[PDB]
Amino acid sequence: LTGTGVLTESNKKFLPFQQFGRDIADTTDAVRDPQTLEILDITPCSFGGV
Amino acid sequence: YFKIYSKHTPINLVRDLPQGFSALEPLVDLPIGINITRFQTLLALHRS
Ligand SMILES: *[C@@H]1O[C@H](CO)[C@@H](O)[C@H](O)[C@H]1NC(C)=O
């Protein structure tokens, strides 16, 4: 799963079978990393108009 | 794939299915790759 963003700690209660989270736009919203099995939140990097 | 979903619900009703809602969480995915058209349940006998 390729993408760009800021990876932070998450407080979302992922069930054990659940791997990743998805938003309305079908982009990944959270991920469970291998080798640690901990739940990471994915937030897009800052952007806006100039 | 043989997908199995399960949920344990503690009940206290006598005969029929309790009326409510409870989602079933998956247990295991089994890469069987086989043909299935029939199924049968396994029970246990009680001998005194
Ligand atoms: C390796 O990954 C597995 C998950 O497939 C995990 O249970 C295990 O803790 C990992 N081992 C190490 C040393 O990170």
Side-chain angles (χ1 to χ4, degrees), chain A residues 34-37:
Chain A
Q35 315 162 114
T36 310
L37 277 296

Side-chain angles (χ1 to χ4, degrees), chain B residues 9-45:
Chain B
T9 300
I11 62 167
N12 211 34
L13 195 148
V14 183
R15 293 180 184 172
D16 214 0
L17 283 172
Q19 184 174 9
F21 189 77
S22 194
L24 264 66
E25 294 163 65
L27 294 175
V28 70
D29 198 359
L30 302 172
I32 53 169
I34 62 170
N35 193 3
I36 286 166
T37 61
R38 294 178 66 250
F39 91 103
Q40 184 178 2
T41 304
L42 293 182
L43 294 175
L45 302 187

